[PDB]
């Protein structure tokens, strides 16, 4: 197909985006490089506004945002709530996903602004990278991060109030503490989450909205920064 | 050191554990066979009462039960409750655990038996056992299972009464769904955790007693049977 080819540019472009990136470290440029040398990178343009990628669907590669802004959406069960995380590139797109018995992705990408991303077959990823220690190493240490994060949760501290239990919850479906986060959530099924009801749920929304931490929309709770929120 | 060694018997029983367990399927017995020749295997004999693991400790090596039964033993931060889960033989230690930024063992692990182990090496794993594609697969496939499962929970339709909600407190805490299980807290912590107070969760507690579900003894609470509560 009619292909401009720049290798020296594709490199750099590379060199400032993946090897950035936890699953690349401990690599040198050379080894990096060769490594890539080895799979089909399929990169793609998306619209601002455009899905990237929709949960359900299968997950049979790793896609590497490298340039521009996308939200993260995840939809509780039964979409009782949703909630909208922006990321900026550099990042890798659920890696836990390429494994597993759910094969299938966990959240949708939307494209926020214009994105550049660029794609690898899990087949590649299996037959070529994986033969590799640094890389098997640095995968395996990022999916097990993820589970023991995930395991350490459930045996913290409770909360004592209204409040901290309404951070929590927030923070808790965050991928990271800082940045602009949405939570698309009606009263009645907040309420429900929290086993607590309108009237306090309000209240308590009501004074974190007061000191600037949380705006409130209809059905709609916007955290401009969620790392306020620690 | 003075050894016995039948090499027939000896594979024969690591047919009969190892080969059975997720991280060793697709394997011929032949393969098998030679991936643990590669290796150096400790066989540790525990009495009953004796910590195999202490939470908190450097995990250093795959750790095997081939016989016997085991308790997992969790404490909560500040341990505000601990949990006894049931485990036996045959069964592979906390594989999340020997990667990531915390190397420690998340739980201490109690023979409640007799019990005989394997354990190998960190280095023996990454060295020799990870270098084969099926090995490696089989571990990811474990520790994004488990990531999975913790990441779906968060999502959750939420409990809509107390004795729903305890019942997911005890289930969310157990690596599995069956089995006995013993929750050591006393009742001023075990409100706090549930975000509800003493004499309704007194209440729902002797109704899921009366029921056969759970024994409540001196801050303690029993459940011989956790599928039960599904």
């Given at each position: 197909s009619d292909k401009i080819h720049h290798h020296h540019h594709h490199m750099e472009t590379m060199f400032d985006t993946?090897?950035?990136?936890p699953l690349f470290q401990g690599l040198c440029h050379e080894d990096f490089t060769s490594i890539l040398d080895k799979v089909k990178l399929h990169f793609i343009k998306h619209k601002a506004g455009e899905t990237i990628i929709k949960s359900?669907?299968?997950?049979?590669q790793l896609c590497f945002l490298l340039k521009g802004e996308i939200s993260i959406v995840t939809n509780a069960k039964e979409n009782i709530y949703t909630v909208i995380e922006q990321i900026e590139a550099p990042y890798l797109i659920?890696?836990?996903?390429?494994?597993?018995?759910?094969?299938?992705?966990a959240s949708s990408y939307v494209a926020h602004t214009e994105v550049h991303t660029v794609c690898i077959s899990k087949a590649f990823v299996l037959?070529?990278?994986?033969?590799?220690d640094i890389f098997r190493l640095n995968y395996m240490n990022i999916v097990s991060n993820r589970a023991q994060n995930l395991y350490s949760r459930l045996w913290d501290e409770p909360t004592l109030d209204l409040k901290s239990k309404i951070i929590r919850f927030f923070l808790s479906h965050?991928?990271?503490?800082?940045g602009e986060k949405t939570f698309k959530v009606k009263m009645d099924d907040l309420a429900r989450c929290l086993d607590d009801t309108r009237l306090n749920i309000s209240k308590t929304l009501n004074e974190l909205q007061d000191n600037g931490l949380i705006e409130l929309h209809r059905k709609e709770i916007l955290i401009p920064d969620a790392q306020k929120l620690l």
């Amino acid at each position: 197909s009619d292909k401009i080819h720049h290798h020296h540019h594709h490199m750099e472009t590379m060199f400032d985006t993946l090897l950035q990136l936890p699953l690349f470290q401990g690599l040198c440029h050379e080894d990096f490089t060769s490594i890539l040398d080895k799979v089909k990178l399929h990169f793609i343009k998306h619209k601002a506004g455009e899905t990237i990628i929709k949960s359900g669907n299968p997950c049979t590669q790793l896609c590497f945002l490298l340039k521009g802004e996308i939200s993260i959406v995840t939809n509780a069960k039964e979409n009782i709530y949703t909630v909208i995380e922006q990321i900026e590139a550099p990042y890798l797109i659920e890696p836990q996903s390429l494994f597993g018995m759910n094969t299938n992705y966990a959240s949708s990408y939307v494209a926020h602004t214009e994105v550049h991303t660029v794609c690898i077959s899990k087949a590649f990823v299996l037959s070529d990278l994986f033969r590799y220690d640094i890389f098997r190493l640095n995968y395996m240490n990022i999916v097990s991060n993820r589970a023991q994060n995930l395991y350490s949760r459930l045996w913290d501290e409770p909360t004592l109030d209204l409040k901290s239990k309404i951070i929590r919850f927030f923070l808790s479906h965050c991928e990271k503490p800082q940045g602009e986060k949405t939570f698309k959530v009606k009263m009645d099924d907040l309420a429900r989450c929290l086993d607590d009801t309108r009237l306090n749920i309000s209240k308590t929304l009501n004074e974190l909205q007061d000191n600037g931490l949380i705006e409130l929309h209809r059905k709609e709770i916007l955290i401009p920064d969620a790392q306020k929120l620690l």
